[PDB]
Amino acid sequence: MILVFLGPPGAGKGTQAKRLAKEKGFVHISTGDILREAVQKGTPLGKKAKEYMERGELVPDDLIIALIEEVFPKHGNVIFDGFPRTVKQAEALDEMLEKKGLKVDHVLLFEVPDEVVIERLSGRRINPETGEVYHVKYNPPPPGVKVIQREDDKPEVIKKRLEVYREQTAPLIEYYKKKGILRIIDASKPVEEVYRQVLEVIG
Numbered sequence: 690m691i692l693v694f695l696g697p698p699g700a701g702k703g704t705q706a707k708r709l710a711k712e713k714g715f716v717h718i719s720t721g722d723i724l725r726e727a728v729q730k731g732t733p734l735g736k737k738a739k740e741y742m743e744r745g746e747l748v749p750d751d752l753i754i755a756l757i758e759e760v761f762p763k764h765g766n767v768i769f770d771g772f773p774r775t776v777k778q779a780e781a782l783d784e785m786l787e788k789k790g791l792k793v794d795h796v797l798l799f800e801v802p803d804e805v806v807i808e809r810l811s812g813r814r815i816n817p818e819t820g821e822v823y824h825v826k827y828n829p830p831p832p833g834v835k836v837i838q839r840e841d842d843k844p845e846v847i848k849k850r851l852e853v854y855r856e857q858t859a860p861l862i863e864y865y866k867k868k869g870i871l872r873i874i875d876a877s878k879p880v881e882e883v884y885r886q887v888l889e890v891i892g
C-alpha cells in the first residue's frame with residue numbers, strides 16, 4: 690500500500706504519519722525531515738536546499754525527485770509525507786511507481802482552515818535531541834525539556850509557505866480527485882480523532 694499525505698502546512702500530516710508508521714509498520718518518507726538532515730549534514734543537497742527552505746519556498750523539483758528515487762524502499766508499505774508538492778513531482782512519482790508495478794493507493798487530504806494553520810505552526814516546537822514535535826498549547830513539551838522553534842515557523846515565513854501551498858500544491862487535489870483516490874480528512878479535530886479517521890480511510 691502506498692499513501693500520500695497532502696494538505697496545508699500545519700495540518701498535522703507529520704504527526705499522523707509518524708504515528709501510522711510506528712504502529713502499523715509503514716515506511717515514513719518525510720521530504721521535510723530528510724531535507725533538514727541534509728541541511729544539517731552540509732551535503733550538496735543540504736547546501737542547495739537550505740535557502741529555499743528558510744524562505745518558505747519549495748526546493749526545486751529535480752532535487753526532490755532525485756531524493757525520492759534515492760530513498761524509496763525496495764519493499765514495505767509507504768507513506769509519502771509532504772511529497773509530492775507540485776504537479777511535476779506528482780507526475781514523476783506516478784512514473785517512478787509505474788516502473789515498479791506500483792501506484793498511489795490513497796491520497797489523504799488533511800483539511801484545515803488558515804486560522805488553524807497559523808495557530809498550529811506558530812506554536813510548533815521541536816525537541817532537538819529526539820526530533821519529537823510538540824505544540825505550546827495542544828501538546829506542550831514536558832517541564833524542563835529544551836525545545837526550539839523552526840525559523841520557517843516564524844510569522845512571515847508561514848505566510849509565504851501558505852501562498853506557495855495554495856499556488857503550487859493545491860492543484861494536486863484535483864489531480865488526485867480525478868483518479869478517484871482522494872480521501873478527505875477533517876484535520877481540524879484533535880489528534881486521536883484524526884488518527885481514527887486515518888485508520889478508517891485506509892481500512
Ligand SMILES: Nc1ncnc2c1ncn2[C@@H]1O[C@H](COP(=O)(O)OP(=O)(O)O)[C@@H](O)[C@H]1O
Pocket residue numbers: 697698699703720721722724741742743745746747748749753770771772773774778850
Ligand atoms: N516535496 C517537496 N518539494 C519541495 N520542497 C520541499 C518538499 N518537502 C519539503 N520541502 C521543503 O522543506 C520545507 C519544509 O517542508 P515540510 O517539513 O514538509 O513542511 P511543514 O512545515 O508543512 O512540515 C518546505 O517549505 C520546502 O522548502
Ligand SMILES: Nc1ncnc2c1ncn2[C@@H]1O[C@H](COP(=O)(O)OP(=O)(O)O)[C@@H](O)[C@H]1O
Pocket residue numbers: 697698699700701702703704705809810812813814822823824825827828876877878879880881883
Ligand atoms: N490534530 C491536532 N490538533 C492540535 N494540534 C496538532 C494536531 N496535529 C498536529 N498538531 C500540532 O500542530 C503542529 C503541526 O503539526 P505537524 O504534524 O508538524 O503538521 P504538518 O506535518 O502537516 O506540517 C505541531 O506543533 C503539532 O504538535
